Amino acid sequence: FPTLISLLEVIEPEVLYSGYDSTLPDTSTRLMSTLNRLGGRQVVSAVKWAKALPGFRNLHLDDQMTLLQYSWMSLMAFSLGWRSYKQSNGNMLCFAPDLVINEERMQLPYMYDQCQQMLKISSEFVRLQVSYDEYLCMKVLLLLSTVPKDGLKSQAVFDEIRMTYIKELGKAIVKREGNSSQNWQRFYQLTKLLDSMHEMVGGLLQFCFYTFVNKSLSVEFPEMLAEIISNQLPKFKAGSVKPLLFHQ
């Protein structure tokens, strides 16, 4: 019988390559389009990941659709943060091994602001010195951290899943340190981080909606993301979305 943490490790998606062509010069439109094309594939990876996530398949199909639509950007941004922390200690954005945006590349028109946002996530990992197991658990929590304002078709199951993974984050913290009462200080810090993710991601979500809607910027989106964004867009304009916070 395998532990839940070890399953989380085995099912974690492998880092994708972008297949960016470093031959041609960089432009804002091209870069953003490349990132979106990469995001499409990363999201498909995340869906396959969710389907293998212990617990997740028990939710109603419509709750599955809902949680993935509401949280895809969180998942992607969080992973980006992790990779950036791991490969460059938060100095560069490591989108893919073949696509790293450093200080210089950020100077492109439009890029600087959006990149500053994504780096915030990265430096959080740096500040708190997050561990792999902590990261894996927090990531699951993000999937389960945004619900519709009037709840889910199977709130029963949802609440149980959410509780299992909170417990799991617990074990992960303990495994780093032992059974001190600094353990609950850490739990606070990490739950504070999960909370601050709604604001940080909200920023990204805004840029995303903007570049999606405003055709004149000529940013392309793959069908996967386009379908999701266009469905998710009215729901966010109508503020019918509720974050689950750990704190006040």
Binding site: V47, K48, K51, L61, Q64, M65, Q69, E223, E227, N231
Partner: peptide
């Protein structure tokens, strides 16, 4: 309406 590919992936239904 409802996002097609995401739906296809989650139901898996022929």
């Amino acid at each position: 309406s409802r996002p097609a590919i995401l739906y296809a992936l989650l139901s898996s239904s022929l």
